[PDB]
């Protein structure tokens, strides 16, 4: 329907232009099916247009991925949200982690863990020192603080009994099963063609290593796979895999609510339909990256249909974005090879999005 490529065009086309963004790509899930674009430049320099096989870092949005795969660990009867974060690191001894479960680490709201994983944090054991040293600003359940260091811990735990690391895991129990065969935490040698270079203040960039980095913000992936990713977001019930869907839903369901927003594992949602001043300013840094009080939602609300689930994700040198509306078989992926201002992503995205609503 040409109707979507109207809309597209006239949304995307002044972002790009007016964020200076060298390469994108766009999917628009409409009824189930996606429709793809793709703008610019994957690499500059050698002129390499960016195609529906270009790989991007996708940033946070890797912990929508660390979400599912923790639901399926659910699901496989491995873990428990309520398990407390020391039932699977028995050397994590210290006072203050008693009450902390992994439902608060993958939730933001295990007391005021930091944003980043400290630089200075590159073995297993100045992990141990880094979260053995750490000291609670507030009592775990009562503020939400957005934080690699939550979620990526939650991310090392949950796949401790499975015996496998969080990127095998990962793997072969999420991205195989959902034929998400070029969609990468660690981009091997004869892929490294399609990966995409990030632009940062005019120089070509990729993400640095960092502890925690697999769980927290390190997959890569192409337009294509994305789609996919959201079309089993979507409608977990078309999987094959019972733990699989079954953890998707899990990410969905809502354990907190603060303003008109609810937290899910990895994905955030809010009732539709949404207001846009709300997702658009929400998802402005100074909002997102802000402290919040919770309300726990007790027993956790099944994942809702009529919601608008999304997640953003950012690196040095790329943006990304993702939301759809289960309920109407509507969605959106955008990967972008520059980091531009989140309201930005997300204002583009409702426009798109309520036009073919």
Known sequence: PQQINDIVHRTITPLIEQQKIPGMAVAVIYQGKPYYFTWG?????????????????????????TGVLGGDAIARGEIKLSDPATKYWPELTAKQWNGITLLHLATYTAGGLPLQVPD????????????????????????????????????????????????????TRVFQPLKLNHTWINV???????????????????????????????????????????????????????????????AQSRYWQTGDMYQGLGWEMLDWPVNPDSIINGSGNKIALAAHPVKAITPPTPAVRASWVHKTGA???FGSYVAFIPEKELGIVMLANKNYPNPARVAAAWQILNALQ
């Open 188 to 250: 091997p040698p004869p892929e490294e063609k399609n990966y995409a270079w990030g632009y940062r203040e005019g120089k070509a960039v990729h993400v640095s290593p960092g502890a925690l980095d697999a769980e927290a913000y390190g997959v890569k992936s192409t337009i294509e796979d994305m789609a996919r990713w959201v079309r089993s977001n979507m409608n977990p019930r078309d999987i094959n895999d019972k733990t699989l869907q079954q953890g998707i839903q899990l």
């Open 315 to 317: 690196t040095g040198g």
């Open 120 to 171: 200075e944090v590159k073995s297993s054991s100045d992990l141990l020192r880094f979260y053995q040293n750490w000291q609670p600003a507030w009592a775990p359940g009562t503020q939400r603080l957005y934080a690699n260091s939550s979620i990526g811990l939650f991310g090392a735990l949950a796949v401790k009994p499975s015996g496998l690391s969080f990127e095998q895991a990962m793997q």
């Open 41 to 65: 430049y994957a690499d500059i320099a050698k002129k390499q247009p960016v195609t529906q096989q270009t790989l991007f870092e996708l940033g946070s949005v890797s912990k929508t991925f």
